[PDB]
Amino acid sequence: IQSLTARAPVWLAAQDTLNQLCEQSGETLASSNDVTEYMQQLLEREREATVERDEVAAQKRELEKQIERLSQPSGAEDSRMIALAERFGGVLLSEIYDDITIDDAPYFSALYGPARHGIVVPDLSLVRPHLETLEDCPEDLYLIEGDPQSFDDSVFNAEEQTNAVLVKSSDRQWRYSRYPELPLFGRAARENRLEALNLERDALAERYATLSFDVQKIQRAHQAFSQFVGKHLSVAFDTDPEAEIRE
């Protein structure tokens, strides 16, 4: 009886913690080996939930980058283009076409092709001395000559076709552009599309929040089991002393 009495309180404390722990989980534990196998299942759920979390994170990053490209001032390769626009006596072409309607936007975007985001500069010889200094610029910079305030349609050997445009860029060179949807120019409704993108990104943020919460829950559950075994196994799953003392 003295031995059982000395042993009892430790076993009782251990049992309370064990009951709380297993009830906190869906599965009921019965032995040391059982607890270990539950550890392993917990690890597998960690490493699955984390993969979904990371993939959703990748989508969210892509969405923010896409939204950000359409932001300012007239959405373009804004990193250097604004400074490059003022360092010459020119104006950004996409900014000149800020006001165009949605109906002509796809046509113009097909027409100008890669040069949509070039700069208008009426001489193009004043840049020739400056040019050697351009070490910080997009890998392909486009320059056009004309009046920035009342720029005339750049002389293109253009030719309209069904839902596409043909152009002779140079002697022995032609480009053929198909009408895109939701273009660059006409940056009035392109705010409409970035509004759609904001609506899209809201859902990704919500879903990512839930997934991160789940991962944290799993991690803390593993922490709880580790703390438990650190403080608990010495008397875990042993026979009940109340019964034997009563006997």
Added chain:
Amino acid sequence: AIRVTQSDRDLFKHLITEATSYVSADYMRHANERRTHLDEALALRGELFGSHKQLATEQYRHVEQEALSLSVNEGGERRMEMRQELEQLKQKIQSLTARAPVWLAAQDTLNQLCEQSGETLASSNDVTEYMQQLLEREREATVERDEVAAQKRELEKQIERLSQPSGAEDSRMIALAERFGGVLLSEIYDDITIDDAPYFSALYGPARHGIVVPDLSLVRPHLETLEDCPEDLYLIEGDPQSFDDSVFNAEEQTNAVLVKSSDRQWRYSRYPELPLFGRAARENRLEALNLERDALAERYATLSFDVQKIQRAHQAFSQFVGKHLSVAFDTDPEAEIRELRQRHTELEREVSRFEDQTQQQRQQYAIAFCEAEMENVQKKLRKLERDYYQIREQVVSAKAGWCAVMRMVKDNGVERRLHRRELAYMEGGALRSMSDKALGALRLAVADNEHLRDALRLSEDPKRPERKVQFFIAVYQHLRERIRQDIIRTDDPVDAIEQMEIELARLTEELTAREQKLAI
């Protein structure tokens, strides 16, 4: 957000703890008091009844060579007492002996397992501490090997993206080059030197991917028929077999090229790397990616091996605590067995002395007061009977209140929150100490509120126990109103603590960094 949640968690966690301790300790003290009352009642009842019948029987009776026996009866009993003690001592030695090889095996495998581990073990709780450290390290290792596997998947995806021949080329463009007399431009300059390749790629710009068609008469009729083609198709006129320099008014700058593309149009480009021309299969890049992939594979292999080692050590410890923990770190039983052998010897000497002494000894040797005293015991019986009567009223009256408290407590408190059954094996002094210190904390915690303050005030009369549980109920309801279920859903605050903890961890993780800072 982290600030607000921190404040809420601190408040909940402290107030709930003090309320729970203050209430539960008193509850258990009452349980123990009732047990003591029942024990006292049964003991005094037992001896009262027994003495009563004895007194009745003694009243009925009341109304109605020598040294050989003593010397042999005592001597024989003494040796016999020691015969039984010898058997005990024998049984004690037998128990210690049955436990001896078990202990020795425990120590042996303990030393072996200790040496298998870097850290040295000295106590049971120390062993379990080391075990949880091992689990922690195992979890970290498996996380790292998973990370490396993910990066190796990324590299393998990048290499797979080098579909054909080494670095993917769009087959649709090959079909288009088949549909018009001509050849793909990159296919024409795919073999130019790597030194000049960046220069050429800068020269051609977007037109790098295009078809060399020397006629330009086949396309125009077929142009309106093209729908699957890339959105920006490029075409150039020249001999595919011996392709003359394309018309560029190209002028070479430092690490860049300038091209007068058209009237009123110049195009400026800088030198890239991985040029579309001069590919030569760019096998060197494929091999650099293979080198990186193989480095990742090797790192993954090492981490997998390490995790396997850790798991094996874990299983060893699980088995040990499954089969030797009961005897781990105990002392050597042989010393105690030796001591009991000395006791056997003295016992055998004493047995010999009594056997000899009894042998020699047996060989040479071979009412008015009772009534008066007993009537006072009868009157003692009467006094004891009224004492029993008092105790009995105490017991029944106490149960009447236990009934009510256990009726009200069934609002989930008794399940495990108030019934802190650990406390049943403690004396009342410790219970009161805990209750008093908990009350000291509560007075400060509850200082501002008035409802809770009134309830706590009412609770401190020992003669009305249900008041304390009512105070507990007030606390729980008060907390439930403050949960702010916009972000939390559990109604039980005690369970809500875990959700506040999770929120703190997640918010601290979101706080990390973005650093994509660049603007006008």
